[PDB]
Write a protein that binds this ligand. Structure first.
Ligand SMILES: Nc1ncnc2c1ncn2[C@@H]1O[C@H](COP(=O)(O)OP(=O)(O)O)[C@@H](O)[C@H]1O
Ligand code: BEF
Ligand SMILES: [Mg+2]
Ligand SMILES: [Mg+2]
Ligand SMILES: [Mg+2]
Ligand SMILES: [Mg+2]
Length: 431
RNA sequence: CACACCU
């Protein structure tokens, strides 16, 4: 890898606060227990922090945090901030809506602030990879909230939008780059950016990015980054099947978890499962929507199995005067952007979507998630229902489960049991 | 598979 030709750089600038350093090992274990933090046995890991002022942040960042009325770091932030700041490779697993984005973005800003300034021809220092274009844009917006107080520049690299403005941003110079894989691979092959200064690599939704469709794109990208980079992977779900594969992209790494070690949903979601025949779904949906739309807070996402079903259900509902719009991978990117912005603003309270909208999206005031079709996996179920109940908010999920979904019943029951939810007897009868 | 993911 030309182990001596590369420039030098530093990774660990973490200074442990005296309020944290004083904790004995037992006291640290009790703090972790109280926050439901588990650090994998045998890994190197700093003590968790428990206040924002422990976390080495620039005063600008603290000012933005206070302006947003953020009082206390979330559990994944409590353990992830110091681990990331220490420069260690890591995997950070915590519930949907629990703050993983800032868990990796704020240490990225510290990391960047300790490196020499970008010159001309310099690629990004921090690269974040995400599975959908809308999620990449959302993460870039979060980053801009905080990097803009320093003079940190960011961009979003993603398909479906003109290449020209993205090439401009990359050539002007960005310290932070958020990307979906395809457009980035395109730009790397054609020399529009490079990863020779990339020392902080984030895989968000990491188990999705390591799946059959994404893993070869990830491999193509990461094979171009120096192996002394820091790599940080994050997700609400971390199935055993991705763990060995993940080691291809990690070095001397540490795994941390919040909540139960098994597959688990956000416990602020009320989870309802309606066992019914496929032919009943239409009527049941309308019944449900009539209830939902009678309430003052009624913003709703309806998930379906295919782009064709998403289009068809949306036409069927709009023809009855329902204010529904849809997002899926066959729409143009300007249309996808417009529909999601209309949903965010509340101008359209019903979003019908494929799994393009299942991960990462943080939309204010979603109160209902409806699985019109049960998803492809129990992990996808956990992510979908996590579009509600963000941060401290509560939410409700309704799922239509048919006999054709029988093979997925066992794991669904386990998820429902882990969350202390009431199980529909028809679901148990299925097994 | 779906579903995402450059052109
Ligand atoms: N320490 C905190 N206190 C309160 N809210 C927070 C905190 N950290 C993040 N949030 C908010 O929680 C919401 C969900 O965060 P996000 O990073 O999207 O969750 P995740 O990536 O874990 O699914 C965001 O609106 C974010 O602004
Ligand atoms: F897990 Be969060 F919904 F990205
Ligand atoms: Mg390491
Ligand atoms: Mg490292
Ligand atoms: Mg879990
Ligand atoms: Mg997220």
């Amino acid at each position: 890898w030309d182990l001596s030709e590369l420039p030098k750089f530093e990774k660990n600038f973490y200074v442990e606060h005296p309020e944290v350093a004083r904790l004995t090992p037992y006291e640290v274990d009790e703090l972790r227990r109280k926050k439901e933090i588990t650090v994998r046995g045998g890994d190197v890991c700093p003590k968790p922090v428990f206040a924002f002022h422990h976390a080495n942040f620039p005063q600008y960042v603290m000012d933005v945090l206070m302006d947003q009325h953020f009082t206390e770091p979330t559990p994944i932030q409590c353990q992830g901030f110091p681990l990331a700041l220490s420069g260690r490779d890591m995997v950070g697993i915590a519930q949907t809506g629990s703050g993983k984005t800032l868990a990796y973005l704020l240490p990225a800003i510290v990391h960047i602030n300790h490196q020499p300034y970008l010159e001309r021809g310099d690629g990004p220092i921090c690269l974040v990879l995400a599975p959908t274009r809308e999620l990449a844009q959302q993460v870039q917006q979060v980053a801009d909230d905080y990097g803009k107080c320093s003079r940190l520049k960011s961009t979003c690299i993603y398909g479906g939008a003109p290449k020209g403005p993205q090439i401009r941003d990359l050539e002007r110079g960005v310290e932070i780059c958020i990307a979906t894989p395809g457009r980035l691979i395109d730009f790397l092959e054609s020399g529009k950016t490079n990863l020779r200064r990339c020392t902080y690599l984030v895989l968000d939704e990491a188990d999705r990015m390591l799946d059959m469709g994404f893993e070869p794109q990830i491999r193509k990208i990461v094979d171009q980054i120096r192996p002394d980079r820091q790599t940080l992977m994050w997700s609400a779900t971390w199935p055993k099947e991705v763990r060995q594969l993940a080691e291809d992209f990690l070095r001397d790494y540490t795994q941390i978890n919040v909540g139960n070690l098994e597959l688990s949903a956000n416990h602020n979601i009320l989870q309802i499962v309606d066992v019914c025949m496929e032919s009943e779904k239409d009527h049941k949906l309308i019944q449900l929507m009539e209830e939902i739309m009678a309430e003052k807070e009624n913003k709703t996402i309806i998930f379906v199995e295919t782009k064709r079903r998403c289009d068809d259900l949306t036409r069927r509902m709009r023809r009855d005067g329902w204010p529904a719009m849809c997002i899926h991978g066959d729409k143009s990117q300007p249309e996808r952007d417009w529909v999601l912005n209309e949903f965010r603003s509340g101008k359209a309270p019903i979003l019908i979507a494929t799994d393009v909208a299942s991960r990462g999206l943080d939309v204010e005031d979603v109160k209902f998630v409806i699985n019109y079709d049960y998803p492809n996996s129990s992990e996808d179920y956990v992510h979908r229902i996590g579009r509600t109940a963000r941060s401290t908010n509560k939410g409700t999920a309704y799922t239509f489960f048919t006999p054709g979904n029988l093979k997925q019943a066992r794991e669904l029951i386990k998820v429902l049991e882990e969350a202390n939810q009431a199980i529909n007897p028809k679901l148990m009868q299925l097994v």
